[PDB]
Amino acid sequence: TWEEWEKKIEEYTKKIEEILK
Amino acid sequence: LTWEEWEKKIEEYTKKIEEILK
Amino acid sequence: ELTWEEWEKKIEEYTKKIEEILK
Amino acid sequence: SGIVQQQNNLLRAIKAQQHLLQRTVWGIKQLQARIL
Amino acid sequence: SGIVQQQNNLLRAIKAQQHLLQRTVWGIKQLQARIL
Amino acid sequence: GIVQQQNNLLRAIKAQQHLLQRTVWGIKQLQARIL
């Protein structure tokens, strides 16, 4: 599902930005 | 380059990366 | 609002920026 | 903040970027199936 | 060029690859909206 | 050690760069097909 897909995108995105602070 | 050659090249590099993170 | 051709250039810009950092 | 912690940090960023990349692959494949 | 310099190199490459990843996400979402 | 871990990260980033290029190619393929 694109709704499922969209959420995982913004999940892993903010996880990365937190890692690169 | 076909979409079948694209899928394999992806999976090829995919397994190559995960094996690096072993 | 970013247009495909402005998108293509930004790809190339950052791509070359990667090769320069590795190479 | 030492070299060891930062290496652990970069590893984690790559691990998280690998998950992002996989999800983009799935998206392209989906579109390719619908378009073609 | 040494461990410190190589670590800064890797950090910079990872940061720019994240810019790449974000732009591929934007491209997929553009296609997906147009298709659907 | 740290040296063998840095070499690992270098190889992983370079191969991940290969991946990104081919996913760019896919987006460009679909985009050219639509327009």
Side-chain angles (χ1 to χ4, degrees), chain A residues 2 5 9 12 16 19-21, chain D residues 9 13 16 20 23 26 30:
Chain A
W2 285 98
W5 181 88
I9 299 294
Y12 289 133
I16 297 165
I19 287 172
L20 311 171
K21 279 76 185 189
Chain D
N9 202 74
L20 192 39
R23 268 32 184 254
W26 175 99
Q30 286 299 303

Side-chain angles (χ1 to χ4, degrees), chain F:
Chain F
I2 287 176
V3 167
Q4 50 239 192
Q5 210 55 232
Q6 251 191 7
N7 294 340
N8 283 353
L9 298 176
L10 184 282
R11 278 175 275 105
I13 296 180
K14 278 183 179 167
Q16 171 171 291
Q17 198 53 24
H18 282 287
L19 266 187
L20 276 163
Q21 270 306 318
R22 267 148 204 289
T23 63
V24 170
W25 173 100
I27 295 174
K28 289 182 169 184
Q29 282 293 302
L30 299 182
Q31 186 268 334
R33 212 55 208 268
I34 286 171
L35 313 163

Side-chain angles (χ1 to χ4, degrees), chain D residues 9-33:
Chain D
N9 202 74
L10 299 179
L11 182 58
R12 286 169 64 252
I14 299 177
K15 277 185 178 168
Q17 276 183 352
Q18 197 56 31
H19 284 95
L20 192 39
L21 233 163
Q22 265 302 318
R23 268 32 184 254
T24 67
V25 168
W26 175 99
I28 297 174
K29 291 182 165 185
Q30 286 299 303
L31 298 180
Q32 189 265 334

